[PDB]
Design a protein around this nucleic acid. Structure first.
Ligand SMILES: [Mg+2]
Ligand SMILES: [Mg+2]
Ligand SMILES: [Mg+2]
Ligand SMILES: [Mg+2]
Ligand SMILES: [Mg+2]
Ligand SMILES: [Mg+2]
Ligand SMILES: [Mg+2]
Ligand SMILES: [Mg+2]
Ligand SMILES: [Mg+2]
Ligand SMILES: [Mg+2]
Ligand SMILES: [Mg+2]
Ligand SMILES: [Mg+2]
Ligand SMILES: [Mg+2]
Ligand SMILES: [Mg+2]
Ligand SMILES: [Mg+2]
Ligand SMILES: [Mg+2]
Ligand SMILES: [Mg+2]
Ligand SMILES: [Mg+2]
Ligand SMILES: [Mg+2]
Ligand SMILES: [Mg+2]
Ligand SMILES: [Mg+2]
Ligand SMILES: [Mg+2]
Ligand SMILES: [Mg+2]
Ligand SMILES: [Mg+2]
Ligand SMILES: [Mg+2]
Ligand SMILES: [Mg+2]
Ligand SMILES: [Mg+2]
Ligand SMILES: [Mg+2]
Ligand SMILES: [Mg+2]
Ligand SMILES: [Mg+2]
Ligand SMILES: [Zn+2]
Lengths: 60, 153, 15, 394, 57
RNA sequence: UGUUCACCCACUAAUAGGGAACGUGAGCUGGGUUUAGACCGUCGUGAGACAGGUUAGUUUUACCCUACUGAUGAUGUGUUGU
RNA sequence: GAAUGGAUGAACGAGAUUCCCACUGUCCCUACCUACUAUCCAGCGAAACCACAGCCAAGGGAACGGGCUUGGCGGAAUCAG
RNA sequence: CCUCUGGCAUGUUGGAACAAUGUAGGUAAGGGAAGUCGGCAAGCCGGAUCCGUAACUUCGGGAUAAGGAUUGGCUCUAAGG
RNA sequence: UGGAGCCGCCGCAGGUGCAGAUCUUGGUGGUAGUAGCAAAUAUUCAAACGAGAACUUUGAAGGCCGAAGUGGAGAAGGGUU
């Protein structure tokens, strides 16, 4: 429905951008009733919200 | 309330109006003239064509700058447009008239849109900022619409 | 009202 | 004050309302005067601009620096399959003008032709001339026809034949054949009318109408170029770089005091798709179409007495934005009006032609057939195959 | 690269607002504000230009 | 040469003369006149002046009517096409 | 015309001129291409200006008329310019 | 000029066309300032290395004066701690 | 139509009669569905929510800002944004 709050918090929990936050688009409803962080920290451990890897910039 | 032009036989004539609607008076006016005197089941069809640009609404009076279109030849006119909001609003009005005819107990598919009338409604206003620190109006011109169907078949 | 002309433009100048 | 430095004016006033031509097929505005003495003939034909190419020829104007020298010369091909006469039509002289008096149509008329009478054919039931053709098979109708011709024989002066193209035979997209009135010029009206009556429902090829090395006048609509500014449409001066409100304009429309802009001032509008009547286009070569006796005779087109190959006037990869000229064609010197595929009215000259250039007999020595669709370098495919040899697609 | 911010409301780089980098246990570079450099006392005699020995500057 | 005007070169068949709000700035340009800055000369006690010279100096608006250019259309002919 | 400074003068100048070399669509003489507009549509939506208005020729007239006189004439509604 | 970290949704809208005028970019045969008040505008020039550098001069400059040549990729060699 | 006061005659009294004042205050037209919503490259596909999606959100792709940032923090000013 609307996951701008979740994406903000997620990023503050991860200590990444929110470029890097990934929310599973299948399991949206679960994410939408996450409101607090530590609800979000639970979701991170389950693998619904994830930190994406860095965009590779080779030096080679 | 009192409508302008009360019907000939109220027994078998349904009514509707919509006051103070945010719809361009001029556009609405013209699409109401096009629709006037149709059979209701034609009229709904026509307005839906106007929504999809399969039939136009000729702009006869308020026609300044309005473009020409092939679709207007039907009407015997060169100007024409596809005012989508105006259709959308007096599709709802028809819907409500059809509702009322059904409530009154009239043959819905005998109803000819006998009388329809778009009147100017009191203007809204918001402002537009212009060159050299002037502030002009940028006003909406909304309308009241009102209409009368009648069993004729 | 509209700006129109500058103060030292003085449109229809006929000295 | 007077204009300082004189210059002649831009564009002609003898060509204006520079507007979009109401017709598409160019009208023969005036057919030649029938001297009732020489034998009957059609005056005009109706062709299609297929394209352009070179020619080469020895030239025979004594005195010139180009006498007995080979020159090259641009030509238009005009694919002109034979015309079917479907009607005749009598005109009567009046002080008002030249009233049309009686139109007799033929019995059978092709769908090529019928097409023209409807704006939509797909939709129509194709009922045109249905009740008309009934007339040709009964006593009352056949008697009514015979009286109508006899009335035309009595009262009419000018007789034009209604002919139409054989759209069937062209590579074009359209099937809707062009009709056209063509003036019969020749002997007495009766003799003229009997000839047309004989030609009804019959083909009329080009070579009947025109001969070779004949000056003709091409009549057609110009290649249309939309709305165009005054600098394109009238070739006025461009104003210099600095001009604040644009420079592809005319600066002074008009003086103050005839306080109206004149019709003689240059304004922007429709450029092209005008009706135009060019004159003195010499037919270099009337060509024969493809035909069969056992196999194809493709040679008879672009082969000459000095080349003797097996070419067609079709260049490699066809004429561009057109097709294969399979039918009989004329070959005019120079350009002609209009775009490719454009229907084109040819008309015998309005003019007694007795100039040294207008009586020159043309023997072509070489017709170029190299591709136009890019810089072509081989005349024919068989020549290319020899030069290149085998390719990987073998 | 980890860019960083001042830790106080004093934005302007001043004599007061001198800093240094420090990596923490948390594995982040952070600013610590530095104390000013103290000077050893000069001699009363007023001719010997060097500053005194055996005194914490 | 800001010039109109003028003169000279060159070509030409000829390099005739004029008008249109000294045609034509919501067509341009702004070189010149003709604001404000400044320089020189002459004049003025002076502020300042100079059909005396010099240099630097904002060129607005059209979507209204008409006109013209092109573009759809209009009344008539029963309708429609040719 | 002489510190109301005269005469000079390297270096410097978004200062004022003149010529030459190079270079060029400045021009002969214009053409084509691209983007954003203008264009048409949906939605939204101002202003200035406005005696009435809005086809001309000539006349006379406050001595250059849309209106008056005498002639020419006049055909809905509009679009881009 | 291109990229990662981080950040945005093209700056108060969209769609369909690709006319004239424009605004902003380009390119032009042959000529080369004939254009114009006036080379305005644009174009030439441009980096580095190696040569080479006039008048005049306050002897500092002028000076990147002017005018030339070279420049890529690859495989080696030599020289510097 | 409206729903609570008003007039004739004789006298008296006046802040007593509007077309104008580039009049004052308020309202409404034509212009006009017109000018316009063109600075800074850019969007596309799917799903979700939802009465309703060109614009919200999630995912995927393509792009830009390109550490003198369209990033991360403050000062003044704002004052709950
Ligand atoms: Mg504004
Ligand atoms: Mg302001
Ligand atoms: Mg003259
Ligand atoms: Mg300018
Ligand atoms: Mg070609
Ligand atoms: Mg302090
Ligand atoms: Mg004048
Ligand atoms: Mg003017
Ligand atoms: Mg001007
Ligand atoms: Mg000046
Ligand atoms: Mg001055
Ligand atoms: Mg417009
Ligand atoms: Mg003196
Ligand atoms: Mg002096
Ligand atoms: Mg007037
Ligand atoms: Mg953009
Ligand atoms: Mg956007
Ligand atoms: Mg913004
Ligand atoms: Mg060139
Ligand atoms: Mg000149
Ligand atoms: Mg010159
Ligand atoms: Mg320059
Ligand atoms: Mg020098
Ligand atoms: Mg009461
Ligand atoms: Mg009182
Ligand atoms: Mg009043
Ligand atoms: Mg618009
Ligand atoms: Mg960039
Ligand atoms: Mg922040
Ligand atoms: Mg910031
Ligand atoms: Zn001491």
């Amino acid at each position: 429905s609307m996951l701008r709050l979740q994406k903000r918090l997620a990023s503050s929990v991860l200590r990444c951008g929110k470029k890097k936050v990934w929310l599973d688009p299948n399991e949206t409803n679960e994410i939408a009733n996450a409101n607090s962080r530590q609800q979000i920290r639970k979701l991170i451990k389950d693998g619904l919200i994830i930190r994406k890897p860095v965009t590779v910039h080779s030096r080679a | 309330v009192r409508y302008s032009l009360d019907p000939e036989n109220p027994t078998k004539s349904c009514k509707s109006r919509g006051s103070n609607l945010r719809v361009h008076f001029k556009n609405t006016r013209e699409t109401a003239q096009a629709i006037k005197g149709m059979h209701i089941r034609k009229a709904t069809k026509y307005l839906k064509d106007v929504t999809l640009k399969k039939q136009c609404v000729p702009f006869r009076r308020y026609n300044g700058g309005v473009g020409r279109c092939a679709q207007a030849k039907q009407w015997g006119w060169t100007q024409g447009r596809w005012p989508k909001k105006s259709a959308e609003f007096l599709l709802h009005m028809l819907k409500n008239a059809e509702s009322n005819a059904e409530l009154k107990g009239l043959d819905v598919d005998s109803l000819v849109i006998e009388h329809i009338q778009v009147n100017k409604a009191p203007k809204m206003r918001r402002r537009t900022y212009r060159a050299h620190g002037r502030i002009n109006p940028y006003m909406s011109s909304p309308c009241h619409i009102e209409m009368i169907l009648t069993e004729k078949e | 009202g509209m700006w129109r002309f500058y103060t030292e433009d003085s449109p229809g100048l006929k000295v | 004050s007077h204009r300082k430095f004189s210059a002649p004016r831009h564009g002609s006033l003898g060509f204006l309302p520079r507007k979009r031509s109401s017709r598409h097929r160019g009208k023969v505005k005036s057919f030649p005067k029938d001297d009732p003495s020489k034998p009957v003939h059609l005056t005009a034909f109706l062709g299609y601009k297929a394209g352009m190419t070179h020619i080469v020829r020895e030239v025979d104007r004594p005195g010139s620096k180009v006498n007995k020298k080979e020159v090259v010369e641009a030509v238009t091909i005009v694919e002109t399959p034979p015309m079917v006469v479907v009607g005749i039509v009598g005109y009567v002289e009046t002080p008002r003008g030249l009233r049309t008096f009686k139109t007799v149509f033929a019995e059978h008329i092709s769908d090529e032709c019928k097409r023209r009478f409807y704006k939509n054919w797909h939709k129509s039931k194709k009922k045109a001339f249905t009740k008309y053709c009934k007339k040709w098979q009964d006593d009352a109708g056949k008697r009514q026809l015979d009286k109508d011709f006899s009335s035309m024989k009595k009262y009419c002066q000018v007789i034009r034949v209604l002919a139409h193209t054989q759209m069937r035979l062209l590579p074009l997209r359209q099937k809707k054949a062009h009709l056209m009135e063509i003036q019969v010029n020749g002997g007495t009206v009766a003799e003229k009318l009997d000839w047309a009556r004989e030609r009804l429902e019959q083909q009329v090829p080009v070579s009947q109408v025109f001969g070779q090395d004949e000056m003709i006048d091409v009549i057609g609509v110009t290649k249309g170029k939309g709305y165009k500014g005054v600098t394109s449409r009238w070739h006025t001066k461009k104003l210099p770089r600095k001009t604040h409100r644009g420079l592809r304009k005319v600066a002074c429309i008009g003086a103050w005091h005839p306080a109206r802009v004149a019709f003689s001032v240059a304004r922007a509008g429709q450029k092209g798709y005008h009706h135009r009547t060019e004159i003195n286009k010499k037919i270099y070569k009337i060509g024969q179409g493809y035909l069969i006796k056992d196999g194809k005779l493709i040679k008879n087109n672009a082969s000459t007495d000095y080349d003797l190959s097996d070419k067609s006037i079709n260049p490699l990869g066809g004429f561009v934005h057109y097709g294969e000229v399979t039918n009989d064609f004329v070959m005019l010197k120079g350009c002609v009006v209009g775009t490719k595929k454009r229907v084109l009215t040819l008309r015998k000259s309005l003019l007694v032609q007795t100039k040294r250039r207008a009586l020159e007999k043309i023997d072509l020595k070489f017709i170029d057939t190299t591709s136009k669709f890019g810089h072509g370098r081989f005349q024919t495919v068989e020549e290319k195959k020899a030069f290149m040899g085998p390719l990987k697609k073998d | 690269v980890q860019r960083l911010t001042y830790r106080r409301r004093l934005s302007y780089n001043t004599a007061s607002n001198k800093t240094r980098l420090s990596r923490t246990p948390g594995n982040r570079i952070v600013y610590l504000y530095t104390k000013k450099v103290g000077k050893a006392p000069k001699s009363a005699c007023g001719v010997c230009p060097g500053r005194l020995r055996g005194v914490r500057a």
